[PDB]
Amino acid sequence: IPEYVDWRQKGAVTPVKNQGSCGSCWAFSAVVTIEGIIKIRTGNLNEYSEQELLDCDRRSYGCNGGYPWSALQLVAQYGIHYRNTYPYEGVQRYCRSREKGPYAAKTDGVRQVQPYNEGALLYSIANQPVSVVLEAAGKDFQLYRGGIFVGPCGNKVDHAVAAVGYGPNYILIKNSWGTGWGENGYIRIKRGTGNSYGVCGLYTSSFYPVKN
Numbered sequence: 001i002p003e004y005v006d007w008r009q010k011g012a013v014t015p016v017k018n019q020g021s022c023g024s025c026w027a028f029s030a031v032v033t034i035e036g037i038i039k040i041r042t043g044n045l046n047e048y049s050e051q052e053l054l055d056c057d058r059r060s061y062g063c064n065g066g067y068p069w070s071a072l073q074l075v076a077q078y079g080i081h082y083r084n085t086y087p088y089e090g091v092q093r094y095c096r097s098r099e100k101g102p103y104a105a106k107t108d109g110v111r112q113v114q115p116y117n118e119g120a121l122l123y124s125i126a127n128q129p130v131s132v133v134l135e136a137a138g139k140d141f142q143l144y145r146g147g148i149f150v151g152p153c154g155n156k157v158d159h160a161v162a163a164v165g166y167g168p169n170y171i172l173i174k175n176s177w178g179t180g181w182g183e184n185g186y187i188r189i190k191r192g193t194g195n196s197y198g199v200c201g202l203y204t205s206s207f208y209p210v211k212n
């Protein structure tokens with residue numbers, strides 16, 4: 001795999017979103033991997049509905065948190081609508097998939113990246129955007145305004161984001177905190193420290209959708 005990967009340069013990443021006060025990071029995370037894999041397989045970049053996962057993933061807890069892998073399983077098992085059809089409202093409501101007509105896109109499954117393995121994560125990122133988790137509670141992460149982020153942070157992972165690239169010394173992460181946070185909504189997190197957890201726990205729990 002190459003020295004640099006940046007899925008934004010391959011037109012596989014949609015604009016940065018703001019999840020708002022809702023604890024829907026898991027849905028935003030899942031969606032950018034779906035947006036990425038649909039573009040990679042079909043050549044079309046579309047935006048898909050975080051709200052639909054928020055509303056419809058019964059194994060997750062709506063705005064109280066949830067699981068990227070659950071959301072990804074639901075798109076593999078059913079599908080997902082365009083964001084425009086099922087826009088983000090920042091609050092869990094009822095699952096309105098049926099009212100929204102046919103699904104816009106559909107994946108074939110979900111894979112886990114071998115945890116605590118930097119190389120496995122990089123290999124996955126070189127293939128497609130990946131849902132990853134990290135500890136975002138620390139003020140250093142929250143006040144991040146740019147640069148390669150080394151912490152400080154623990155491994156109490158609490159926030160799902162999407163890895164959309166990497167370089168020699170960083171993994172490139174799309175956050176869901178709007179374009180004003182970090183580097184126009186992105187953070188570069190240091191890699192290659194030998195910390196098996198990843199910095200801020202980045203290697204704890206990583207998933208990507210499969211699309212044939």
Ligand SMILES: *[C@@H](C(=O)O)[C@@H](O)C(=O)N[C@@H](Cc1ccccc1)C(=O)NCCCCCNC(C)=O
Nearest residue numbers: 023024025026064065066133157158159160205
């Ligand atoms: C995301 C956010 O919007 O900031 C956050 O609320 C969230 O969903 N965090 C998850 C991330 C995660 C997923 C899978 C493995 C590891 C981390 C989280 O920390 N836990 C998922 C369960 C929901 C959080 C706790 N909920 C309740 C009701 O206690």
